[PDB]
Amino acid sequence: GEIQWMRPSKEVGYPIINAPSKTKLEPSAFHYVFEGVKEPAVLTKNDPRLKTDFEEAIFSKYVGNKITEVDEYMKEAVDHYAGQLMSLDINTEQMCLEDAMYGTDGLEALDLSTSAGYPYVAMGKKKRDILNKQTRDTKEMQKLLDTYGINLPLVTYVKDELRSKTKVEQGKSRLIEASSLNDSVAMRMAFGNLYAAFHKNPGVITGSAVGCDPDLFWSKIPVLMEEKLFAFDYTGYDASLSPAWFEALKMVLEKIGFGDRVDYIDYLNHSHHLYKNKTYCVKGGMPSGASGTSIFNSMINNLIIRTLLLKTYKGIDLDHLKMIAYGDDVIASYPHEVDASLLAQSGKDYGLTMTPADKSATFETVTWENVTFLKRFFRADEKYPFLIHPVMPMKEIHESIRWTKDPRNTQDHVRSLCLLAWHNGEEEYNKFLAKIRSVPIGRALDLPEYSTLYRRWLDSFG
RNA sequence: GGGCCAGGUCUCUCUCGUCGA
RNA sequence: CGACGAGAGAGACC
Known part of the structure; x- marks a missing residue:
């Protein structure tokens, strides 16, 4: 991912966004009873705990893109993964607008306690003003589709969260891209039947954990896994993803029957952004809070591991690979031990920066004693x-x-x-x-x- | 509440019910 | 005991 250009939103006619300035997080009656070292994440430039320049820091996650073209391993990676998914017999039909708004089986209704995004934010309009779960009226929203269309800008906010000392000082706060109410709906209509299928089938077919309840599911995971495990952490996974990977994802969506909608994925790769008084374009990198970010991050994550195994371990039967991803997080099994140190090196050539699991110092062997997930x-x-x-x-x-x-x-x-x-x-x-x-x-x-x-x-x- | 913040998954709590033994 | 509906409120995780 790379920022293509930035400039004062007034230069272009976009309004300013009211970003909040102070944290909701406060010390609690138990603040002194327990030991802790995390503090609320930096939210603004004026913050006295900063040890560098804020906006420089927050936007530094976009490391740049590595590759523009899908390699041969990726192409096979695609083929295999799309193959798995085919076994689910996933309904490829467009989802009806009423369902993409108010929910249906396997898909939750939109959240009316959250913002509707641009342009509604600026008119001071609200989701509750267009949606009504009582009537499940779709007529008004439809007009807003007709009006403002789609591929609207993402409104970018700072994530309000507990973060470690250095990351506080170093200003490395996380970002949130607020999808237009218009784009969430178009996405849900296009991919809702896709989303629901994943929600319904967490495991080693989908390669996704979305929809699991750790209290019950933890006992099922070792059963689904092959004999030996491997794992790793990513650095800034979302903002590293090179446009090549989006092209791969699109290929998977054609191959499983969503060929006409593969255009929506383009808006996620080439996005435009509002942030307080500024405006910018980005090429590459998955937008934090767009519709389908958990699903697509998991899918691309499924392609990456298949790719890396190929350009590293020739003669690997991807049929005996068993992994589960939640976005960037992943637990993976294979019948023979595999060398994360070795896949890490391959990854470099893909813009992927891959560190040892559990923040460990040097690469190590993953066992059921030291493996973590969520x-x-x-x-x-x-x-x-x-x-x-x-x-x-x-x-x-x-x-x-x-x-x-x-x-x-x-x-x-x-x-x-x-x-x-x-x-x-x-x-x-x-x-x-x-x-x-x-x-x-x-x-x-x-x-x-x-x-x-x-x-x-x-x-x-x- | 403290001074206008996304997409989701799961869980818990309160209130109102549909179908169900 | 069993799914799910809405109205709320929150927590963790990605």
Whole structure:
């Protein structure tokens, strides 16, 4: 991905966007009870914790493109992957407008608590003003399609989130591209039946995790995996993706029957952006919050691993590759050990910057003891070894609890962390309930015991 | 609430129900 | 006990 040009949105006639200036995150009643080192991400240039120039930093993720042409490995990569997907018999029909707005089986209705994007943002208009779940009226939206059409600009916002010290100082905040209400709808009409099929079939056919519930699914994953595992992290995955990869994705969509819509993918590759007082074009790089970003990032992720294995390990039977991706995250198996250090080198020639898994120092062998997925570990239950605990380390749970976006919700917030935390096992869990209760607000909460959660978990296989 | 923020998945909580044994 | 509808509110993850 590469910024093609930038300039004052007034030079062009685009309005300014009101970006918020201060975080919703504040220290919580538990801020001093636990240990943490994360703070709210930098949101603006004036932020005193900056150790460099903000806009320089936030936009630095676009490293540039590596390749414009789809290689022969990619082409095969495509063929194989499209092959898998064909086995799902995926409905290729356009989705009806009423469903793309208000939802249907396998696809959730649009969120009316979020923005409608450009141009509606600027008129001060809102999603609730065009959609009505009660009537499920489509007539008004249709006119807005007729009016403003599609391929509208993405409105770019800073992600408001807990981030590590250096990343705070270094100003490396994450970005969010706000899809036009018009484009989400066109996308859903074009690909809704695609999205729903993925939502319905998380696993090793789709190669996607979207739609899994880690509490139940963790126990199914080892069963689907081949004998040996490999894995790695990506650097700035989204903003590295070279336009070649989009062309590959388009090929997959033709090959599985979505040939006419492969144009929509073009708007994701060559996008135009509003950001406060500025405006810019980007070539390459998946836009953070466009319709289908989870699905397409996973699909391209499926093509990358197939490609890299080919231009590295000749005579690899991609039929015995078993992977699951959530966007850039991935867990992958094969019958013989494979060398992430080796695939990492290949990746370089594709604009992909691939580091060792679990932020490790040097490349290492992945086992069921040290593999992570969606930030969880795998630990077999001590009494039912075919049941696998998704294990969120306490460390990340400690970080979360030390802040809040509204103390009014302190009970829900903490209750929700227990559901993650108890998989560390009774000892650490009761020590966690102890620390919560070591302050008065702690003791005002209704919290569940290990015995209760362990019971409910065991019962959900049933 | 603190001063106008995307696309999603899963989970939990409150209120109202449809079909269902 | 079993899907799912809407109205809310939140948490984690990508």
